[PDB]
């Protein structure tokens, strides 16, 4: 009963967060095995950020110019390298709290938990979605760079995001753990447009299934639609087109509730054309698109880790 925006338990990631200092700049790093990962702009000063030559800047740094602390445990840096937009510092000690982990590049529309950190110390945890335009709508202040996003699969942490910057529009951009930005963005203080964003249709549908399961049912109607007819409405309202692959991903929820996917599409079509008429769904007066079908099933089934 109930439906909340729920994050993964963050303990396994907390034990990997460290503080990385290079000269005047300090930010967050991720210590896994004997490597620390952090944004490469740790090597920049404020003046460098407008058109940094990162290869040139890194050449002026030696191992001993990087200080890494895990709590008050000082780590010794014995190597450094740059991979795309991330810096990898080899340290002389393997993190004893390293969880089972992998690095994943997530798809737009997928969700993950963010552990927001400052000066290497965890501050809070929240859930969010990779937007279709490869931004995230996070909560980040100065000093949060290097905070990571992740999913947890039983005992395995899949790291998918490292925070690098806030755009002038107030939305957030970052990389995977190989240092490749999501979206068109560069780690430079220069004008950068984010794409037109859209609403994640398959997630909205999943959330409507979650609502029915919890007893919010007023939006169910006697109409149906076709995939093609629904997608005409999706395009008008700036929703992502629904594909058969999306229909298939909703199969388990359709099976549990007995509501065909295209009938739920007919409900969503009426909500888009008519609004909510002052009503709410799972405590929201908007259509929510940051729960995936997997999220809904996990929360409506009680999967643990």
Instruction: Please give the structure tokens belonging to residue 66.
Output: 């990087």
Q: How many CB atoms lie within 10 A of CB 267?
A: 22
Q: Would you count residue 164 as binding ligand XEK (CB under 6 A)? A: yes
Element (H, E) at 13: helix 11-14
Q: Tell how strand 111-118 and strand 121-129 pair up.
A: antiparallel
Is 145 near ligand XEK (CB under 6 A)? yes
Residue 26 lies near ligand XEK (rule: CB under 6 A): yes
For residue 141, state whether it binds ligand XEK (rule: CB under 6 A): yes
DSSP category for residue 152? E
In whole angstroms, what is the distance from residue 118 CA to residue 69 CA?
Answer: 13
Q: In what order do the strands lie in the sheet with 17-22?
A: 73-75, 66-70, 17-22, 25-32, 35-39, 86-91, 77-83
Which is nearer to a copy of itself, 230 or 293 (by Cβ)?
293
Q: How far is CA 123 from CA 24, 152, 252, in A?
A: 22, 19, 36
Residue 4 Cβ vs a copy of itself, minimum distance, rounded to whole Å:
4
d(CA 228, CA 241): 9
| CB of residue 193 to ligand XEK, shortest distance in Å | 10
> Which residues 125-164 are close enough to bind a copy of itself by CB under 8 A?
125-126, 128, 137-144
The DSSP-derived string for 109-145 is T-EEEEEEEETTEEEEEEEEE--TTS-B-----TT-T
> Which of the following is catalytic: 16, 22, 38, 41?
41
Looking at beta carbons only, is 140 or 239 nearer to ligand XEK?
140
Considering only 61, 76, 90, 188, the residue that binds ligand XEK (CB under 6 A) is 188
**Interface residue with ligand XEK, options 3, 8, 112, 140 (CB under 6 A):** 140
> Which residues from 185-204 bind a copy of itself, rule CB under 8 A?
none
Per CB under 6 A, 1 contacts ligand XEK: yes
Partner from ligand XEK, a copy of itself, none binding residue 168, C-beta < 5-8 Å depending on class? ligand XEK
The closest of 295, 289, 284 to 219, measured between CA atoms, is 284
Q: Which of residues 41, 80, 131, 172 is near a copy of itself by CB under 8 A?
A: 172
Applying CB under 8 A, which residues contact a copy of itself? 1-12, 14-15, 115-119, 121-126, 128, 137-144, 166, 170-172, 214-215, 280, 283-286, 299-305
Q: Which residues are catalytic?
A: 41, 145
């Amino acid at each position: 009963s109930g439906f909340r925006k729920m994050a993964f338990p963050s303990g396994k990631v907390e034990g990997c967060m460290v503080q990385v200092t290079c000269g005047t700049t300090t930010l967050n790093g991720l210590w896994l095995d004997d490597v620390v990962y952090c944004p490469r702009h740790v090597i920049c000063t404020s003046e460098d950020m407008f058109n940094p030559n990162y290869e040139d800047l890194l050449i002026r740094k030696s191992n001993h110019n990087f200080l890494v602390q895990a709590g008050n445990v000082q780590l010794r840096v014995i190597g450094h390298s740059m991979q795309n937009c991330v810096l990898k510092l080899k340290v002389d000690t393997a993190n004893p709290k390293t969880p089972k982990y992998k690095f994943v590049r997530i798809q737009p529309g997928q969700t993950f938990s963010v552990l927001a950190c400052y000066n290497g110390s965890p501050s809070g945890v929240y859930q969010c979605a990779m937007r279709p335009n490869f931004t995230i709508k996070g909560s980040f202040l100065n000093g949060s760079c290097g905070s990571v996003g992740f999913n947890i699969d039983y005992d395995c942490v899949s790291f998918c995001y490292m925070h690098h910057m806030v755009l002038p529009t107030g939305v957030h951009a970052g990389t995977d753990l190989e240092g490749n930005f999501y979206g068109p963005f560069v780690d430079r203080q220069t004008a950068q447009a984010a794409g037109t964003d859209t609403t994640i249709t398959v997630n909205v549908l999943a959330w409507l299934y979650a609502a029915v399961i919890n007893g919010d049912r007023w939006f169910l109607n006697r109409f149906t639609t076709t995939l093609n007819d629904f997608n005409l409405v999706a395009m008008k309202y700036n929703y992502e087109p629904l594909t058969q692959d999306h229909v298939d991903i909703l199969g388990p929820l359709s099976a549990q509730t007995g509501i065909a996917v295209l009938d739920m599409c007919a409900s969503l079509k009426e909500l888009l054309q008519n609004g909510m008429n002052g009503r709410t769904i799972l405590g929201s007066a908007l259509l929510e698109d940051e729960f995936t079908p997997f999220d809904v099933v996990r929360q409506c089934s009680g999967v643990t880790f």
